């Protein structure tokens, strides 16, 4: 059961982010290209079609703490969004409300988190929510 240390796992994620995955509807990379701790990431999600998120690009901040990937990362939207599980004033993602975070496993990754959030944007309870104007961002 050979565990890959945090820093080497995050280097694998960096390489995968640079190569891209799937159809490119989520992407991720380091927020600061000199951050040797590989802690702060920028996430991107393309809002899915036939939802009120469609044709919008969402930017997020993903923080991988000292216990990642044994522990889930923290996530917040920078782009404003009305979505269950996202605090509509700060953009913080409530881990208890997002199944991949609430039931985190060490096999998960930044890619999996972003793909889950994009999948949840298609849910009956999110896809119809009226959205803030495009382009707005939270403070901080």
């Amino acid at each position: 059961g050979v565990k890959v240390p945090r820093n080497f796992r995050l280097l694998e994620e960096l390489e995968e982010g640079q190569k891209g995955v799937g159809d490119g509807t989520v992407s991720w990379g380091l927020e600061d290209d000199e951050d040797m701790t590989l802690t702060r990431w920028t996430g991107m999600i393309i809002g899915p079609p036939r939802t009120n998120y469609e044709n919008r690009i969402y930017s997020l901040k993903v923080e991988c703490g000292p216990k990642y990937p044994e522990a889930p990362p923290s996530v917040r939207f920078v782009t404003k969004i009305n979505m269950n599980g996202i605090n509509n004033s700060s953009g913080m993602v409530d881990a208890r409300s997002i199944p991949v975070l609430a039931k985190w496993q060490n096999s998960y990754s930044i890619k999996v988190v972003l793909q889950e959030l994009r999948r949840l944007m298609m849910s009956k309870e999110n896809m119809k929510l009226p959205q803030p104007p495009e382009g707005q961002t939270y403070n901080n």
Binding site: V2, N7, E34, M36, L38
Partner: protein, 149 residues
């Protein structure tokens, strides 16, 4: 149960027989992960500095290369902004006959003899190529700023 014999031996040989200018500590949780400190080599602009390096022995070691990375910021044409090391024996010239000891000395040798001609990094290499005196002074500056505590 347990580590392969080779890894038991190589883990152990360190503590009984440290490499000159290099210290290692085991990670508190992961028996294949080590926290290394490399002294800047004698007569280099890194001399007097100490540089953190992390080392991991993956599942397929020694068929697979050990993974290493600097965790101290260093101005060197073969080390990038994230500490990744461009060294042949870490990729494509790895062979199971090689040992951790030899990898560490080879990294010391890289610090002692930078190679701007075949550079990771071209920003730093270009500086080392075209204004080597300034590049060496900058390497010393970064040693002062990042590698003295």
């Amino acid at each position: 149960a347990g580590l392969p014999r080779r890894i038991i031996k190589e883990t152990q040989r360190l503590l009984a027989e440290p490499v000159p200018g290099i210290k290692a500590e085991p990670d508190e949780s992961n028996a294949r992960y080590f926290h290394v400190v490399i002294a800047g080599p004698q007569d280099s602009p890194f001399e007097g500095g100490t540089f953190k390096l992390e080392l991991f022995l993956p599942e397929e070691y020694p068929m697979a290369a050990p993974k290493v990375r600097f965790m101290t910021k260093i101005y060197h044409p073969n080390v990038n902004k994230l500490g990744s090391i461009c060294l042949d024996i870490l990729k494509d010239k790895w062979s199971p006959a090689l040992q951790i000891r030899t990898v560490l000395l080879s990294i010391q040798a890289l610090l002692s003899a930078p190679n701007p001609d075949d550079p990771l990094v071209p920003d730093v290499a270009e500086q080392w190529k075209t204004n080597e005196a300034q590049a060496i002074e900058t390497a010393r500056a970064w040693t002062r700023l990042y590698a003295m505590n």
